[PDB]
Design a protein around this ligand. Structure first.
Ligand SMILES: OC[C@H]1O[C@@H](n2cnc3c(=[Se])[nH]cnc32)[C@H](O)[C@@H]1O
Ligand SMILES: OC[C@H]1O[C@@H](n2cnc3c(=[Se])[nH]cnc32)[C@H](O)[C@@H]1O
Ligand SMILES: OC[C@H]1O[C@@H](n2cnc3c(=[Se])[nH]cnc32)[C@H](O)[C@@H]1O
Ligand SMILES: OC[C@H]1O[C@@H](n2cnc3c(=[Se])[nH]cnc32)[C@H](O)[C@@H]1O
Ligand SMILES: OC[C@H]1O[C@@H](n2cnc3c(=[Se])[nH]cnc32)[C@H](O)[C@@H]1O
Ligand SMILES: OC[C@H]1O[C@@H](n2cnc3c(=[Se])[nH]cnc32)[C@H](O)[C@@H]1O
Lengths: 165, 167, 165, 167, 167, 167
């Protein structure tokens, strides 16, 4: 069971708007970078340039750019052995959720690293995410577990203690 | 070409509970029921699984793993049987459950019809790239909702998302 | 949710050696034949002839026959919307199990109809089958449920009360 | 066993050049129309998407990315909805689009009926390994075209390719 | 061609508990550990999931749905990560768990190496068609078990099952 | 981001005829060998299965079903093990085997690098829709062949086909 070489190929999915989300991603990268079970980590926001767009994030983008960028992400999922999603429970990212469903449809494991800045609200989760994810590591209290998690086999850890939406 | 018998099997995805959202689903059903190209429609919230071993089933509480598995699988089964997905997509309150299955359906190479709804037309028209590119056909819920009754679900002609800022 | 036309396309998997197994299959067919939610039922033992085999069941078969026959079965699984397996708990059929795993890998629903002529033995099941199957209908006490089951949506019914092997 | 209703959903793949190719396609449709096992038939060249931004569109000419995506997806949607593929395979001028589709369908584990055509029945009979082993059923177009009218698409009985040299 | 680094990721499937079966798995590990083409080996029975909410975990009893889900998924995850499967197949006592994953792996188009074992060589040599055809490479456990240390898992060359009666 | 170890597993598809084709294949291997991102490279024509029952086997001649299955499966196994495909695509004589493989890989959602070659750089630039939209990255073989030595196969950056008429 002991890998002769790292085989964990990570698809790090995550929103990239607010500074918080930006901070989590930069850290998650630092953590995963210490994990000996990882061989490669892909982060989609690290892009394609359409020599025809005379372009802004959030603006109207060319179809060529859209296709190339969306494909770069699907390619990342294809090459990956598992997904790690810095999941924002406050501002739900539909892009991230899409990717989770896509990865599960491909039968790949998905580690959910939820984050919330509202401890007051009863921890609730949509069924699809709750039953779709294979392993959960609380981002607010276990973010560091990512540096040790064995990605060569991705041990399961069902979602529990969450009210199913 | 013209089908000999209805071939469309719809997986109707949509957020629920919310008053407006329930309204949409209800209207979506009526519209689909009028489509001659549809053989079957599956809506996840209709019937449910009852875990006789569940004391006071909290429709938002913890809920047993037995009910979770059985309910989740009923959804994957609907996706499996469907020929296409029709999603009543709320642009104001993004539903990750809906997004999950869109990606799940696209991974299976099945067509997905996105029906966006927004109560704030004055607000920015922006969509996540994965949704904008993942979807194969868009039908504005606020303006073309009625097209669901005429749309040919035997072939699901595509209609790329356009006119939305992308992030 | 009410189908305008039947959409249930059944892949009826089952051993076909003993007379018992042969009896169950003939009955399962009769039952399913009464179900209004079924549009078609495929039973693999209903074959290909290789005009080159100068052949016996259990004997050495030509590769052409093997390929054509195996494919006829995969084609049946491809066309099917769900599988119904007359599962023998006494004499485990690896062919049937293979097909269950194949169908689940394709995310299709699988109805397990177990049979046993040894009520004395503690009901035990292999994990993969127990967690792989989506719906179970006891063959010894609910065989008739197949005539009523709604195959247009295949309601879930997790396996319970079985010792996991 | 006997089907209560037609369940065959055919993806009719085919080059759409030379008068010979479009004529075979024509005949293919006629034959399929008379088959009681067929529920629906999709021919990629029958409809077509129209991109308003695209001016003076021409076949073989530079096309917009939007038109390309929509059209490609329409073909994949057809493959997804199909229960089996029927390819009018031109053995004289190999068509990579059809071959791409045969491979895509086999990856999805769907049956593929190959219907080869040659204007030179006397030249050597050779076939690429992937096509020869990828297809599940072969029906010669030059002498058995007509059985598309009777073939049982509810079950698609296999019939391995034999008699062709392999390269 | 020659790999720059081990690429083989094995999913070692096999029945357990039985004295002889445990022996095989143990020997299989040793043999694989000596293969230069292997980067990783996953054996389902090694480590396990503990459900802190499980009183007296009966290794054959009912067992919680939480443990079942988590354990089953650990297996599907091993199949997902693997590049190929190596199954210590007991021909005397057929293991449906092993058969399930063989089919699951073949549906994913992954290569499967079958390693049959029998304590009754005097008995009929027969194999189920699905196994005989589903498998891509066979290595007799009773006579070539040692080949597991030389086999190139970077390319998994096929070796069709032959010499077995088929039912 | 930077990979700890090479993770690119290439499926090198290519016709294996004319001296030109086998020479490109030769060069392709040389270039790939010098790419630090490549862990392994599979070329379908490098090894080969041998069927003892088969006597006087010849290329293009009638082959045994056992040889056909083994060889076809060896190619599918290669596609399964591969993280991406690289096709030395002959634009002058279309090869259905390569096209079949491109489609099979795209159905599995794997990236496909197309490397087109033409001995007539002046003739019209036209490509079949499925190939043009199916591939994720194009690298001209006639003027950019050499970048196979530097392309980042750990991530395979997309590069849509443009400049080709579509038919
Ligand atoms: O919501 C974030 C997720 O969706 C994808 N994504 C959304 N917008 C993107 C731009 Se602009 N560029 C690259 N990838 C992008 C990512 O996979 C990320 O996981
Ligand atoms: O298949 C996913 C669909 O299932 C619906 N759904 C079914 N039961 C659910 C409970 Se309880 N909680 C949250 N979502 C639930 C989602 O709206 C999604 O469209
Ligand atoms: O074990 C029985 C299962 O395996 C397949 N099968 C095994 N031997 C077969 C012969 Se001979 N002919 C046709 N199908 C056959 C069936 O799919 C059946 O479900
Ligand atoms: O992935 C399927 C493999 O899992 C093993 N397995 C893991 N835990 C199991 C319990 Se508890 N019971 C029965 N089988 C079990 C099977 O041998 C099969 O190879
Ligand atoms: O090359 C033959 C196959 O490929 C597809 N195809 C190639 N170019 C196309 C245009 Se322009 N429009 C729609 N479909 C097209 C067809 O599906 C056909 O089977
Ligand atoms: O036609 C080009 C492609 O198809 C395959 N192929 C066709 N005939 C073959 C014989 Se004979 N042996 C091994 N592979 C073979 C190759 O994978 C190549 O990419």
């Amino acid at each position: 069971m002991k890998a002769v070489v790292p085989t964990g190929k990570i698809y790090l999915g995550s929103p990239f708007y607010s500074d918080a989300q930006r901070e989590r991603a930069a850290k998650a990268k630092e953590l995963l970078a210490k994990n000996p079970s990882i061989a490669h980590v892909f982060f989609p926001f690290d892009g394609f340039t359409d020599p025809d767009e005379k372009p802004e994030i959030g603006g109207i983008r060319s179809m060529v750019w859209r296709d190339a960028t969306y494909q770069n992400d699907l390619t990342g999922i294809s090459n990956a052995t598992c997904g790690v999603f810095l999941y924002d429970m406050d501002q739900l990212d539909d892009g991230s959720a899409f990717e989770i469903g896509f990865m599960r449809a491909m039968h790949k494991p998905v580690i959910l690293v939820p984050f919330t800045e509202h401890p007051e609200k009863e921890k609730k989760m949509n069924l699809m995410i709750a039953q779709g994810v294979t392993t959960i590591i609380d981002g607010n209290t276990e973010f560091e577990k990512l540096a040790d998690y064995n990605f060569n086999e991705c041990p399961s850890n069902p979602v529990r203690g969450y009210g199913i939406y």
